[PDB]
Amino acid sequence: IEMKKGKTFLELRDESVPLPFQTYEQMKDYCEKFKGNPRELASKVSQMQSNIKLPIKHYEQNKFRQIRLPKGPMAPYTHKFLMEEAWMFTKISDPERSRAGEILIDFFKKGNLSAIRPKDKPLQGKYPIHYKNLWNQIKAAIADRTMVINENDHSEFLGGIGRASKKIPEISLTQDVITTEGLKQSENKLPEPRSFPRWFNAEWMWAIKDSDLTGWVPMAEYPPADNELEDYAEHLNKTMEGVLQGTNCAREMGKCILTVGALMTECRLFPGKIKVVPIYARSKERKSMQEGLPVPSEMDCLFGICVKSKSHLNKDDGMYTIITFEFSIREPNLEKHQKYTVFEAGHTTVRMKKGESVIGREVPLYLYCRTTALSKIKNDWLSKARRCFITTMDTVETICLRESAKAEENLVEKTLNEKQMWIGKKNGELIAQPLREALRVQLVQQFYFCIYNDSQLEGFCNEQKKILMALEGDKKNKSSFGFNPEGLLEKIEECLINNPMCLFMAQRLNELVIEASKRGAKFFK
Amino acid sequence: MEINPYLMFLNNDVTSLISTTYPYTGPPPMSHGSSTKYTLETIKRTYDYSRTSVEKTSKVFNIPRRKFCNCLEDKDELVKPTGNVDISSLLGLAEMMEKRMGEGFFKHCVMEAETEILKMHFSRLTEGRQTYDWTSERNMPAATALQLTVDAIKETEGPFKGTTMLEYCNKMIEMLDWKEIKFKIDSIKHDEFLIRALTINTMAIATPGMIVRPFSKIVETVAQKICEKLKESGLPVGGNEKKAKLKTTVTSLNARMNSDQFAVNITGDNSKWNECQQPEAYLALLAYITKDSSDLMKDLCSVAPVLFCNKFVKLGQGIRLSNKRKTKEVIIKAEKMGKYKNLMREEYKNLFEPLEKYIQKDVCFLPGGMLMGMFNMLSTVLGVSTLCYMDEELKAKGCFWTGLQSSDDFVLFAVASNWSNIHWTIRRFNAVCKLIGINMSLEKSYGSLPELFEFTSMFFDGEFVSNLAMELPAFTTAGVNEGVDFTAAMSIIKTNMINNSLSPSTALMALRICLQEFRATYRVHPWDSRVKGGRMKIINEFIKTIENKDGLLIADGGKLMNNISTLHIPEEVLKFEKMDEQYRNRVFNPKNPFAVVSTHSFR
Amino acid sequence: KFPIIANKRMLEEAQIPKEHNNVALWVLASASCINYWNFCGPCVNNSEVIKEVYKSRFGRLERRKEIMWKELRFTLVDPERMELIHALGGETWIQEANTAGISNVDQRKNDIRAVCRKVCLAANASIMNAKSKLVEYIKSTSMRIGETERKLEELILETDDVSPEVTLCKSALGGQLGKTLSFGPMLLKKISGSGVKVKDTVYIQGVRAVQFEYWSEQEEFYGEYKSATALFSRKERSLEWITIGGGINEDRKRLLAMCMIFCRDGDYFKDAPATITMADLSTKLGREIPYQYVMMNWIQKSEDNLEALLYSRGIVETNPGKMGSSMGIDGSKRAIKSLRAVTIQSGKIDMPESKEKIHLELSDNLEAFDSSGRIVATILDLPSDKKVTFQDVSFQHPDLAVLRDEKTAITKGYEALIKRLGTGDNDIPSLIAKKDYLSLYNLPEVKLMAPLIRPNRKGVYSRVARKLVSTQVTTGHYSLHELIKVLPFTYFAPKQGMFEGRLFFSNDSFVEPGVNNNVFSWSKADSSKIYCHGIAIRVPLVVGDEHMDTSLALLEGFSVCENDPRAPMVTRQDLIDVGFGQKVRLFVGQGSVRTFKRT
């Protein structure tokens, strides 16, 4: 028995071999009889150690430096929807009409949408007429009880503005044709570099706040229990869900979930067609106007509408396009709102408590228009937003066992209610809150990671780890040593082009090392 | 006020909060498109890391063959990655490792791998991530291309009745010499079939065909049988065993040296671990290994190496043209880019002319390197050989080293009695590593005192070993059945808990999330819910006919009953005695038109 | 649409019609077909075959069912189980679940020490009757210790387990000691030397001053902490030398800090931190505290305090040949730089034994004294009061336990409401049949439960409850369950306001009609039971129809009616502007909708 040999294989084997050997047999004999001469090997490695000129540092005599950010205009808003400047109409939830096609029609019946009549001239925008005619067509379609749009003039345009052209076969090509058309390779456009955003902090603060309504995110049930572990597991989960569900970030999470759940189905059952889809969310309880306690209130909310272009999700890496019509009661700013075309759509009403009754105060109303693309992978990534709860729950639990083990007793409630965590600086002084209140910051961080996910963020997060470990070593009086820090600084500065988060987690990393210098000796000023 | 999320690292550790730095696991939305630009840059950097200029025209293709092994030149600027290997030092390190472990070590391992292969069925090759068809010229699972190959063999020269790996390999060999080959209909000649078999496609993770697959599997089996006996080999498994290895190493170290020495750790990250591994050195190493064994294995292990010494690389989608206003856009393939080089930009031109020699029709005859994520075990073995080095020059100075190495990530532990000899030892180690192509990065490799380091996302510290390899399932991409995907997820979560990457509350949250993902996937909901979906319609009427709602299945308006202590137990086994006998027998009816064998399968 | 494949004869032989209810189901087929097959299809009896084939899985299930779950505990490191190690023990936690072995001694030790701690704490409520109240608590506390119903006057003596609480409680019994000490959670012991007490001062904020005491002579001791041994010598308010043989970071750090306080070494015994000035309270609610225990408490707050204390101890650069026996700021075994007068090593320091028993004397603050002062124990070295459920226990003397909580208060109120029924005149059914509801608004039990009510908006709750009660009584349609649920609110006067759908107590809890809740729940087919936090209570009567009529227990001026989807959904507020003959849907709970009509 043996592997019967061919010919071409043997020729290759005898060909592909090291330099001094030209046949498999010579190399084989040299190998099977190789003997050890550690002296020549030591001389060779010493010679290499001579020609090599490795640089080794200690971070003390040659410290790090602050990062040099790009320069230019501010980084604009990037997410698809609106978080802080949003607005929503409300209505009662019917389990018999719990679908987008029905919820949208119901919202339209009372005629609050038909009252939305944006004027011709906008405040800041590019293609206002297309958006306006498209909004009229959307209202017409909803009136017809069909979400479809027959005419394809505006959607087609706004979907083709990115790229649309003819194509000539290579076989029909000559030199005179080329010289006539001036054909040349298609110069790739490299993304431009932006400055530090001055609105991230406001959005973060707003997200940390508590929403009037609650129950934005749906969850499964809780199985039975058979011992103290599962009970204690149930206890932590309930409290943590107690705190995070009431936050404005949960609202955006539920909105993304319920909107993507409809878009992923529309791109499946009506491909190559133009459909209409709402931007809605569902709540289950609020807080009394007379009492700060929860109250059952099942309700639906509509933030805006999203139109769909032709989407097959089997070509062009499954790229498709949409168009957003969101509502707002806050005039825009020119910097943050650059990709948005804005209008003024009449007025609306706001409702607030007045003693033991409710009143209504009329306010203006704005309409935010924007175009953007998506894909199948982005849908699968957004639909799975809940996993953010998994990570925040996990960071809460690492802090409630480590301590519980140092003292060898249950300290869960004690640490949650007492353990203070630095959150920020106000008036040149630190601010601290309990863990029960920093869960919000952790969750918002994870969410923003889930939104602005991109290669830039991957590199940033993969690189900052080294700085963090160096800092930790500094704290505990350990002579951390490296080889080329400036190269790492460059690796990190090259992946800061235009991802709002990456630019604003860099400015914030700079500021962690300017405060620690007061107790560390490995960083410049 | 200003919210700076990072100020919690001051009065706390890092092993507890580092997880907050990286996003959650899942399929990334980055989706980088392997296209002509990146592949050509890769090939260029490959030919460049070869510090030689020698060549030898072949006789099977009439093409040069850059032989970058044992011909080192251009010593200048050796800091950057190198690929020229020295066989003498390689075999010397192999001999050191053999002496350490034992004499009949390689022999025992190769014998075990052989005997294991003998009783193996070629059908095993169907278990693979993906491959590249040599007939349709596309990428597909292993089973599809395997069926294609066998039916082509049938159509051309009769069926393959071996039903074993060895007959499959010999059939491939014989086919290498066939002049004409058919397939559903069209045929091809010898040279074209050879090329196709030696073709590779970028998925730029490689995606080889099926001819070389079994030999690669054999070599990997051998390398695995070897890596098990090695203490410093964290590749085959991770977690509990990995921590055991870590602590064993650390304790042996602490008990080894004396009071006068002071240790140091280093977090290293090999750069270009795929563009500096050469199959020629692997071939010589395998030869030295099997030197004393059945010639069968001697010849077998020498197959995949040469198959990788000659590997045509499929260039991605060709470039596109356009006029000024972009109203017209032409599309051309790769094979014709040499026909319009006068138009492409310089950066794209200077990256194309020097390689035109190696192009044949649309591919590039890469004579070496190792792009696939293959031979990882073998590379790890080579690294362990690097770490098992020791001589008298060190002993005289009272210094040495040790550590652990993954595929392309490692951790070093140096020992000395002075704050300078450590530098000498580090430089010695880097030199011996570069002698055989194994390089190291400088902007991503750091070091500090022994207490702190990192390895495969497991950030070790004086205590509080923290993991970050939290995996999860995915139903939409891999939909199988409504009675397996939940049990598999439960087992996965159990595993993750074993590796300490998950905690009780975290596991429960992940479970309640995966349940909802499952339901939304198969479009199912409970009965309490006021849903109006198709599958619910019938369930909204045939539900009152039962009382054991607890026993109901999740796929049929059921509710959860499993928990942490009941994961290994499928919900079925947990509801059997509880399901109303009617529904029970209605499910377990083998007389139906269609792990636990349910009446819930989607063939 | 029909991706799932199937067989053909298998389909007709089962008589599976397509579009049964507009669902095609299908060779190919849909997924709903499986639903239709498992809900209406052939019936087999193959359970035994399935079990036999899957014996391994079902034996694993059986084994799992054969477990006696035990407690869990947070701690660190100083086949049939491999199937469950994932859920048995991690690294920070572990569960002591057992299979067949039973031995109840160490759990008994934990229980007895916990209760001793408890009682010794309970005696810390006066200033003069400490020993008296203590001993009387002891004599009034019995236990079903293990399996024997023993008293807590002999276990403290029969047991041999050194501890601050055991000693602190046994000294009052003139019991034998073992010459052991307790400075906080740490355990100390003397080896050689001796001295006398001496006083000195220490400033706070840089202006004030406070007196503490110490020893001036040389004396060696044997410290000991969790997984950490040590040896050291104290001399003149300062630590001369010290050695350690237990290798752990946190344990060594805390043990060293405690031994330093025991030696009062450091400058913070000259001045004080700026954190102490925040309080300057070396005092309890009405008692005094030394400086050492205040410093300790300041340590327990954060490890930064520990690091500051250790920095107060001189840090220097280690010389060669000493790395193996050096130390670091974070407990690192060896380091280029270490702390002054330190020595690390491996192997736990063998602890000596003293075979000389003695008896101490308690003080006003219960501090025990053997001789030459040398306090051996006190309450100051105890943890804060930690509520823990005690079982197998009897505690009779007052101060035994508060046993008073809002939950228990509500439970007792509802028990009284239920018993009041009493199947007799001048009780719930007689007033019902008589249609005298006003008297219900004056009963004693509602007056006892009134304090548990939210005061700010009790008028509206009473109004609504008095509406429901009258509307259910007059008509004769009612349900004792919902009545008793809402009665405690029918005491105060009615007022105008906005109601939401929930009745809130003062403990932030609530109750809601027409639904069930942990505090109060019930269901038909078991109407003779009423759950209260899972505690099933009984009804002194029997009913089969008095409860079946809940058409008026949901809303105030409405009545349930037949379901009708056409009716529009509404809220609880717009109800005021409805008319008659106008049906309306409305949520009565979570995803629970019902139709209502006025009157």
Swiss-Prot record, chain A:
What family name appears in the similarity comment?
Answer: Belongs to the influenza viruses PA family.
Mind telling me what this protein is named? Polymerase acidic protein
What note does UniProt attach to the cofactor annotation?
Binds 2 manganese ions per subunit.
Q: How does it assemble?
A: Influenza RNA polymerase is composed of three subunits: PB1, PB2 and PA. Interacts (via C-terminus) with PB1 (via N-terminus).
Q: Which UniProt keywords apply?
A: Cap snatching, Endonuclease, Eukaryotic host gene expression shutoff by virus, Eukaryotic host transcription shutoff by virus, Host cytoplasm, Host gene expression shutoff by virus, Host nucleus, Host-virus interaction, Hydrolase, Inhibition of host RNA polymerase II by virus, Manganese, Metal-binding, Nuclease, Phosphoprotein
Q: Does the keyword Repeat apply?
A: no
What does the record give as cofactor?
A: Mn(2+)
Q: Which gene encodes it?
A: PA
**The organism's place on the tree of life at top rank:** Viruses
Swiss-Prot record, chain B:
List the EC numbers from the record: 2.7.7.48
Q: Which GO terms describe its cellular component?
A: host cell cytoplasm; host cell nucleus
Reaction it catalyzes = RNA(n) + a ribonucleoside 5'-triphosphate = RNA(n+1) + diphosphate
Show the PROSITE patterns listed in the entry.
Answer: RDRP_SSRNA_NEG_SEG (PS50525)
What biological-process GO terms show up in the record? DNA-templated transcription; symbiont-mediated suppression of host gene expression; symbiont-mediated suppression of host mRNA transcription via inhibition of RNA polymerase II activity; viral RNA genome replication; viral transcription
Subcellular location, in the record's words?
Host nucleus; Host cytoplasm
Q: Known post-translational modifications?
A: Phosphorylated by host PRKCA.
Any GO MF annotation of the entry: nucleotide binding
Question: Which InterPro entries does this entry report, sorted A to Z?
Answer: RNA-dir_pol_NSvirus, RNA_pol_PB1_influenza
A Pfam family annotated for this UniProt entry? Flu_PB1
What keywords are annotated for this sequence in UniProt? Eukaryotic host gene expression shutoff by virus, Eukaryotic host transcription shutoff by virus, Host cytoplasm, Host gene expression shutoff by virus, Host nucleus, Host-virus interaction, Inhibition of host RNA polymerase II by virus, Nucleotide-binding, Nucleotidyltransferase, Phosphoprotein, RNA-directed RNA polymerase, Transferase, Viral RNA replication, Viral transcription
Its main localization is host cell
Region feature (Promoter-binding site): 213-220
Q: Which residues form the RdRp catalytic domain?
A: 250-446
Output the HAMAP family linked to this UniProt entry: INFV_RDRP (MF_04065)
Similarity section? Belongs to the influenza viruses polymerase PB1 family.
Q: What does this protein do?
A: RNA-dependent RNA polymerase which is responsible for replication and transcription of virus RNA segments. The transcription of viral mRNAs occurs by a unique mechanism called cap-snatching. 5' methylated caps of cellular mRNAs are cleaved after 10-13 nucleotides by PA. In turn, these short capped RNAs are used as primers by PB1 for transcription of viral mRNAs. During virus replication, PB1 initiates RNA synthesis and copy vRNA into complementary RNA (cRNA) which in turn serves as a template for the production of more vRNAs.
The protein, known as: RNA-directed RNA polymerase catalytic subunit
Origin species: Influenza C virus (strain C/Johannesburg/1/1966)
From Swiss-Prot, chain C:
What protein am I looking at? Polymerase basic protein 2
Family stated for the protein in its record: Belongs to the influenza viruses PB2 family.
Assembly and partners are described as: Influenza RNA polymerase is composed of three subunits: PB1, PB2 and PA. Interacts (via N-terminus) with PB1 (via C-terminus). Interacts with nucleoprotein NP (via N-terminus). Interacts with host ANP32A (via C-terminus); this interaction promotes viral RNA synthesis.
GO terms under biological process: 7-methylguanosine mRNA capping; cap snatching; DNA-templated transcription; symbiont-mediated suppression of host gene expression; symbiont-mediated suppression of host mRNA transcription via inhibition of RNA polymerase II activity; viral RNA genome replication
Tell me, what does this protein do in biology? Plays an essential role in transcription initiation and cap-stealing mechanism, in which cellular capped pre-mRNAs are used to generate primers for viral transcription. Recognizes and binds a wide range of cap structures of target pre-RNAs which are subsequently cleaved after 10-13 nucleotides by the viral protein PA. Plays a role in the initiation of the viral genome replication and modulates the activity of the ribonucleoprotein (RNP) complex.
Q: Which organism is it from?
A: Influenza C virus (strain C/Johannesburg/1/1966)
Compartment(s) of residence: Virion; Host nucleus
The record's keywords, sorted A to Z, are: Cap snatching, Eukaryotic host gene expression shutoff by virus, Eukaryotic host transcription shutoff by virus, Host gene expression shutoff by virus, Host nucleus, Host-virus interaction, Inhibition of host RNA polymerase II by virus, mRNA capping, mRNA processing, Viral transcription, Virion
Highest taxon above the source species:
Viruses
Q: Which Pfam families match?
A: Flu_PB2_1st, Flu_PB2_2nd, Flu_PB2_3rd, Flu_PB2_4th, Flu_PB2_5th, Flu_PB2_6th, Flu_PB2_7th
A cellular component annotation (GO) from this entry? virion component
